[PDB]
Design a protein around this ligand. Sequence first.
Ligand code: HEM
Ligand SMILES: O=C1CN(CCCn2ccnc2)CCN1Cc1ccc(Cl)cc1
Length: 394
Amino acid sequence: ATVLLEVPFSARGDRIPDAVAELRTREPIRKVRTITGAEAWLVSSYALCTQVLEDRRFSMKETAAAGAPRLNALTVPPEVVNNMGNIADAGLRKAVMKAITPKAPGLEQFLRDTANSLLDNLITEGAPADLRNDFADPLATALHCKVLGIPQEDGPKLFRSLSIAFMSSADPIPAAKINWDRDIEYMAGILENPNITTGLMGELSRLRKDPAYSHVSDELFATIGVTFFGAGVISTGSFLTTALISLIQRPQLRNLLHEKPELIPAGVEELLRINLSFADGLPRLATADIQVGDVLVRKGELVLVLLEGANFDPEHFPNPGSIELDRPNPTSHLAFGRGQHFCPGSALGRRHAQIGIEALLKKMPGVDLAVPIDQLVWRTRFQRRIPERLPVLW
Ligand code: HEM
Ligand SMILES: O=C1CN(CCCn2ccnc2)CCN1Cc1ccc(Cl)cc1
């Protein structure tokens, strides 16, 4: 006898388990057990993943309901699971979305200058360099301090909450509440701080005092700061880290992108498609009985949308494990989700990665791992797959 198949399958972000393609072929919606002991439906084909993400009867916010089967423990107050919904309801969606585009004057120049300064410091110090802790993550943190309008010197302390905040735990995490409450207090002070006039926090600070927003709660304004910082920093630093591994392991591609940097955007789109940064499927709770493939999902059941299941599906992306810069459907991957909850930071995340890669390849065209790939240490029970350190030479 064997137990019910457990998720997640592997915390390694450098290879996809052969198991995923076997599941997709045999049982593209299959029962699994999560780390909490709950049962869930794991969806692993492009067609069924799209179906789930485009049907709002598979609800994000209802995953926070008391008593529901859970992927993992909440790390925020349950209303924050409906974060973008709350933003929309407050009339703040357009403003938030405008503040987080990479098109603000000087932002791309700031990103480039920051990337180049980080790389120059690594070059001065000498190999080996850690491209996660001393490049990708500080570039993410600096970008988000700029986007938010908060001091660069406050980035590191906000960043250090994230190794706990984005845990994927069976049980509530006491440190997550301590850091959440602290980071909320910080953002509440930022809204009252007259020096903060630019970026997302500067714009929220002004809307807070405008009559059209007089009944929006101060808790929501502070929450938007904490959540956008954390979500953006963890996602962009983690994606860039694991994309650099995929690039370094493909010297022919590295050389092509170094020689023809106009191909970087197509390259980043393929790196997005093959990315294994999300450690778990995206959770949804059924609010009705819904047919998904051969399974009738019942009301109140948990469904997990496996992004790599979709993005490595050969029926949608032929030769899925190969980076091909001339696919006819290049942006049709699910790396930023799909439907109601499609990532509002998608443009910023593309630009962060494009600029970080462009700068790396110009400064370190010989970049290579400085340890055998199997020696990377993959963070466990976390919402992202990331190596603890990424040692390189050049
Ligand atoms: C390469 C970088 C990123 C990746 C791969 C990524 C991926 C995703 C995915 C897959 C979703 C959908 C989640 C779901 O449907 O359950 C999503 C939603 C979200 N992303 Fe990102 N993201 C990135 C960058 C960012 C940035 C830079 C921000 C903010 C500054 C951000 C903020 C959010 C928010 C707030 C949502 C929820 C949207 C809603 O619920 O309507 N992300 N992202
Ligand atoms: O606002 C969101 C959106 N998330 C979408 C999936 C993760 N993600 C992050 C970036 N791109 C995708 C889910 C959770 N929350 C609430 C939340 C955000 C940030 C913190 Cl620090 C605490 C809670």
